Amino acid sequence: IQQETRLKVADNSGAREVLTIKVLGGSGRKTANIGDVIVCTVKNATPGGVVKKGDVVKAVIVRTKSGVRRNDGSYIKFDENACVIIRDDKGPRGTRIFGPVARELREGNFMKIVSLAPEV
Amino acid sequence: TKGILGRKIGMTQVFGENGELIPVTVVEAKENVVLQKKTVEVDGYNAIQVGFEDKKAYKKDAKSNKYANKPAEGHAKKADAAPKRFIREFRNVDVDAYEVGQEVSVDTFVAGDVIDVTGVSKGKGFQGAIKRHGQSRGPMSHGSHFHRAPGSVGMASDASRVFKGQKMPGRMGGNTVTVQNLEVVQVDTENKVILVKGNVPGPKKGLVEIRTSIK
Amino acid sequence: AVPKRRTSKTRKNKRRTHFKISVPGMTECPNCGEYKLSHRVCKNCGSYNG
Amino acid sequence: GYRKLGRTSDQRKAMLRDLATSLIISERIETTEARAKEVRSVVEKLITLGKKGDLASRRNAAKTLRNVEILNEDETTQTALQKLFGEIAERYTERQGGYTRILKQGPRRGDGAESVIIELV
Amino acid sequence: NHKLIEAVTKSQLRTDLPSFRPGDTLRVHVRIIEGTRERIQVFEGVVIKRRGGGVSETFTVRKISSGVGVERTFPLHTPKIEKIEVKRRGKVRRAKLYYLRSLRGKAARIQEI
RNA sequence: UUGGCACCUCGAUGUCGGCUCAUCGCAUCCUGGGGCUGUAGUCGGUCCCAAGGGUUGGGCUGUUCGCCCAUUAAAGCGGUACGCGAGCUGGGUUCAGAACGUCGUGAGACAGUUCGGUCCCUAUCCGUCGUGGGCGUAGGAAAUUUGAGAGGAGCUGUCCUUAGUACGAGAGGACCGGGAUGGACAUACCUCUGGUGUACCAGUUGUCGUGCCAACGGCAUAGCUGGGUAGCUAUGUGUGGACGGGAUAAGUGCUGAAAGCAUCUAAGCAUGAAGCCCCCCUCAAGAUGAGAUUUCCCAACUGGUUAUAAGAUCCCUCAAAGAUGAUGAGGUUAAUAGGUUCGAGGUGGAAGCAUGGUGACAUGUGGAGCUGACGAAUACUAAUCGAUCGAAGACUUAA
Structure with a gap:
């Protein structure tokens, strides 16, 4: 959300918490909202998952305390x-x-997420 | 069509037909009258004066501008109409209105006329560089004494002076501002009110003039 | 800062053009006869009658 | 509030309670024009409460009014509340508002600040 | 309350939806115009707040779905809230139930009236 | 830039790097238009014209530089006392302390390194940004304006379509067009989401008061805590950079000879850029070249004077305006502010009483009681009475 925000990865991908690095889209954009692709690095993980901590990956913002x-x-x-x-x-x-x-x-192409999401 | 004059009542919200919530500004436009019709006999520019709100008739006490003085009363009789407040002048209309004063009804605006609004913006008295010009205020903790002043006000000793159009503190707001490409949500006769998508300049009770967008 | 150059006594009197003070805005009392200050009570004799 | 009186909130509220009590004790006082423009609106509402008369209307009066006793009842001792609910209320029981009037006196010496005589109508 | 503002914007007001109180439990039957059709995805839960007046009257429902609480703000007079049905009337002792946004378990219970 | 000189300054012109604020050049990083390729297409290379706008966030380091992480259309190179300390900082370098290595017999010094270490000033003039008064604008006024000029804005990606089309074995993948939608940034506003909200509502602790109970008040950051009205606000909500004409740059030419030919140029004729001038927005007649249009007032006495007219103020009630003045809304023939009666919104079920509990309490009476700024009506109070300022229209010439 802010290039320092610690997000809770709600996905069963080994990663648990991630730190935002950059909010993609725009030269100098500073805020992401629900449905925005963020580059982030893994700060915590579960033992034995494909995403091991200390790596840079991509994510999408699914929940937010400010909303839409x-x-x-x-x-x-x-x-x-x-x-x-x-x-x-x-x-x-x-x-x-x-x-x-x-x-x-x-509205984006994250139809596989909503298909996998427990509810919308 | 006929750009009219109005008084800014407030803001409200309406619901569309797909239920989209719409912010709307409410304007009342009652007692529009055309007071005079310029031609090239007068400076060479077609135009019409319209007066919006009416004053009282002539009086002898006459010390608060609610009572039309004699010149304005003469001018308002020459079109055979009551003395109006807020005389304004519209170009970009064909001279098909009469030189006499016919009521300029709001019904000329018809349900989706892209219209732009002009009014004097709300007044902020003598704001500083941060507020008035949206400048970045200095730090506040690390031993700093610069918080909200303007920055530097020029180069040192090559120019040796301060250029014009420098951003310094002064009186803010008040200017005439114009918002373009607004929409007419509804036109409610029996109240002479018009509903505009968005928010026009100026405070409540403030004069606004509507026009059909030149773009 | 300090004045770089003393103020000529012409510039002093130009700056002091608007330093005049205005009249008190007074009227004649219709009871006292003497002068009162408009919208005030007659110091000399009695009521305000308004 | 309408106009801060060069005081702080507790200090200004004490100021206004004192002025209102003194006004309904003396029925006319000489003050400054802004203090009077405020004591006006305070004592108006106090006498509205007095005209009401009910007990809650008495306990609400009893919080924005001080505790002085009027010795000069000719050996009688009224409190300010007893004064305000008998005499002031029974007096003004006809008119619908507008219970005072301010009269400018002129510039006080030592300030040049206008002095007014606020009194009960 | 300006009579002209009201006189304009008082056809937009729905007329049949019931009057609840902020602390009651509601079920809102919203509509979903996405895709090529509508559904009625009920949103249940407690009424955290009602706010404002006029056409601009909103309320907020709050429900804890699965370890995560979602709040939804609806204007009252939206034509999308098809109906509102009140399950149980809670007793709250205040207007805005904001303390419930930090309670998590059997602490976020409301009595019945 | 590293220097070379030693011309100004030693009765004093404050260093570097950041911050705030910029501004200018073009030797153009991006976007715009072209030529030539060893340019099949997507992408390039290199030249030419172009300065309108744009040109990121971090890690390390006092650092500039620099190396790196991640995006970006691009992360331009320079001037402005290596821009800017009477705008900010004091992290480095060059004040006194202390220590290491080292040079010195020594006091002590560095090729160095490390821990600590007072950054004063009320703006007179010019300048700049906002705002009033005077006089002028050949009568005295109210209102509406035109526009000579001046300022503002000017950016850009991505997805769909044409079309998997052209081009290519394949792989890959279009110009020119239409469309939708973002980033950044400008501006307007407060309906919504929020923030504030110190004369609003509620709860609650200690202590002192109103003689006691009950109910209230004072003090303790506003005692603290939960909400919140008007106003002011962004992170909230709308809008913007549209579409185009004219003259052009590099280029593309047509016609065309000097020079039988060819030749874009000499005469002539077009086309051709995010650039120039208009179009968009704003100030603008002190524009002394002081413009215009409509309406108002226009007598009495002696070259002229006078007051009064139209009108404007003084004074007073104010707020949508405001540092003050000015701006607007009003001054009783009156709704300008206060009060009053209604509401709106805010709080959240007042006091008293009855009931149940033995008691803290609970319920009913009752969405009750209170309620600052928002809407309406009402002359109850105050805008009383008065006073000042303000014209009689020069001179020629032609009609």
Whole structure:
């Protein structure tokens, strides 16, 4: 969200917490929102998962404590930020997803996430 | 169509047809009248004066501008209309309005006329460089004594003077500002009100003039 | 800062053009007869009658 | 509030409670024009409460009014509340608001600050 | 409250939806215009706040889905909230239930009226 | 740049690197237009014209430089006292302390290295940014304006389509067009999401008070904590850089000879850039070249004077305005502010009483009671009475 924000990876990909490095899209952009691809490095992990700590990967912002406006005066505000570690295609790297995800992620091509998400 | 004059009531929100919430500004435009019709007999530029709000008739006490003085009353009788406040002048209209004063009804604006608004912006009294020009304020902790002053105000001793258009503290707001490419949400007759997508300049109770966008 | 050069007594009197003070804005009392200060109570004799 | 009186919130509120009590004790006082423009709006609402009369209307009066006793009742000792609910209220029970009036006197010496005589109508 | 603002914007006000109180448990039947069709994805949970007045009256529902609490803000008079059904009337002793945004378990319970 | 000189300054012109604020050049990093390729296409190379706008965030290091991580259309090179300390810092270098290595017999010194170490000034003139007064603009005014000029803006990616088309064995993959949608940045506003909200509501602790209980008040950052109205605000909500005409640069030419030919040039005729001039937005008639248009006032006495007219103020109530003045809204024939009666929104169920508990308490009476700035009505209070300023229209010449 901010290039120092510690996100909770809600994806079963070995990584647990990640630190934001750069918010892709724009020369000098400084804020990402739900459905925005961020470059981040893994700070914590689970023993025996493909994403080992100390590596730079890509993720998408799935939850946020500030939320989205949804174009018709309807606000959604999750309780804690979270990201899914993702590949160079708009598709997840893991196999499970934990917790809610936002519907404005479907406008992008993250249909595999919402397919895997437990609810939207 | 006929750019009219109005009074800024407030802001509200409406719901579209796909239910999209829409911020809207409410303007009242009652008692528009055309007071005079320029031609090339007068400076060579077609135009029409319209007066928006009416004053009282002539009086002898007459010490608060609510009572039309004699010159304005003459001018407003020469079109056969009550003395108006807020006389303004519209170009970019064909002279098909009458030199007489017919009511300039809001009904000329028809449900999706891209219109732009002009008004005097809200007044901020004597703001500083940060507020007035959005400059970056210096640090505040590490032994710093520079917080909100302007930066340096020129080069040292080559020019030896301060150029014009320097950004220094002074009086803010108040200027005439114009917002372009706004939309007409609805036109409510029986109140002479118009609803505009967004937010026009100036405070509430402030004069605003509407026009059809030149772009 | 310090004045680089003393102020000529012409520039002093030019700057002091607007330093004049204005009249008090007074009227004649319709009861006292003497002068009062408009919208104030007559110091000399009695009421305000407003 | 409308206008800060060159004081702080507790200090200004004490100022206004004192002025209001003194006004309804003396029924006319000479003060400064801004203090009067504020004591005006305070004592207006106090006498509205007095005109109401109910007990809650008495305990609300009893928080924005001081505790002085009026010795000069000719051996009687009214509190300010007893004064305000008997005499002031029964007096002004007809008119619908506007219970005082301010009269400018002129510039006080030592400030040049205008002096006013705020009194009960 | 300006009579002209109201006179304009008082057809937008829905008329049949019930009146709850901030602390009641609601079920909102929202609509979903994405895809090529609508559904009615009920959002349950406690009423954290009602706010404002007029056409601009919003409320907030809060539900803890799976270890994660989601809050949704809805304007009252949106035509998308098809209906609102009140399960159980809670007792809150205040207007804004913001302390519930930091409670997590059996501490975020509300009584019944 | 490293220098060379020693011309100004030793009765004093403050160093480097950052910050705030910029500004200018072009020897152009990006975007724009072209030529030539050893240019099949996507991408290049190298030249030419072009300065409109743009040209990132971090790690390390006092550092500039520099190396690296990650994006970017691009992460340009330079001047401005190596721009800017009466705008900021004091981290390095060059004040006193102390120590290491080392040179010195020694006091002590560095090729060095390390820990610590007072950064004063109320702006007179010019300059700059905002704002009033005077007079002028051949009568005295109110209002609306034109525009000579001057300032502002000017950026850009990505996805879909044409079209897997052209081009290529393949792999790959288009010009020129349309469309949608972002980044950054400008500007307007407060309906929404939020922040603030010290004369709003509620809870709660210690202590002193109103004689006691109950209910309140004072003090303790506003005692603290939970909310929040108007206003002010961004991180919130809208809008912007549209579409185009004219003259052009490098280039592309047509016609065309001097020079039977050819030849873009000599005469002539076009085309041709994010650039110039308009178009967009803003100030603008002190534009002394002081412009215009409409309406108002225009007598009485002696070359002329006078006051009064239209109108404007003084004084007063104010706020959408404000440092003050000015700007607007009003001054009783009156809704300008206060009060009053209604609401709006905010809080969250007042006091008293009845009931249940033995008691802390709970319930009903009752979405109650309170409520600063928001909307409306109401002359209850105060804008009283008065006073000042303000014209009688020069001179020629032609009609």
